[PDB]
């Protein structure tokens, strides 16, 4: 604990909440956007890819 | 965690940033501040990040 500021923060009531979307989910979103762009251009932004 | 009281009175409880093994179970009413008890082992237990 002594060599970590996070433990002192926690012990004094200051905590960090995790994001709702994980990094894996965000990477899935970006890969879907990339696949749409390189396979269908701008059509998937306006309707069906 | 609740749906509306207009839907149900059932709730779930999230103990934030703790392991399910270290979840406070206190048979005595003077060794824990929340006085209500939701049976950890009895009810459904899931461990999220
Ligand atoms: C909860 O504790 C057990 C035993 O100490 C450990 O193996 C497990 O990894 C802990 N939970 C998480 C989510 O790390």
How far, in Å, are A3, A35, B13 from residue B31 at the CA level? 30, 56, 19
Mutate to test the pocket of ligand 1, among B14, B17, B19 (most ligand atoms within 8 A of CB): B19
List CB contacts (< 8 A) between A18 and chain B. 49
Contact indicator for A39, A49 with CB cutoff of 8 Å: yes
Residue A27, SS3?
Answer: helix
* Residue indicated by tokens 């509306």: B4
List CB contacts (< 8 A) between B17 and chain A. 15
Residue in chain A lying closest to B49 (CA): A18
**Cα angle A6-A9-A10, degrees, rounded to a multiple of 5:** 85
The conformation of residue B42, written as its DSSP 8-state character, comes to T
Q: Is A8 left (phi over 0), alpha (psi -120 to 50) or beta?
A: alpha
| Tokens read off for A33 | 């956007």
How far, in Å, are A12, A17, B18, B23 from residue B14 at the CA level? 20, 12, 9, 10
- Please tell me what resolution, in angstroms, this structure has: 2.2
Contact indicator for B16, B43 with CB cutoff of 8 Å: no
- Per the entry, the structure determination technique was cryo-EM
Closest CA to B47 of B26, B16, B10, B4: B16
């Amino acid at each position: 604990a002594a060599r970590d500021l996070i433990c002192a923060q926690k012990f004094n009531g200051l905590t960090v909440l995790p994001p709702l979307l994980t990094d894996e989910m965000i990477a899935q979103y970006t890969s879907a956007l990339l696949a749409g762009t390189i396979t269908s251009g701008w059509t998937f932004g306006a309707g069906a890819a | 965690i609740t749906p509306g009281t207009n839907t149900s009175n059932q709730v779930a409880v999230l103990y934030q940033g703790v392991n399910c093994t270290e979840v406070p179970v206190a048979i005595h009413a003077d060794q824990l501040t929340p006085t209500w008890r939701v049976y950890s082992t009895g009810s459904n237990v899931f461990q999220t990040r």
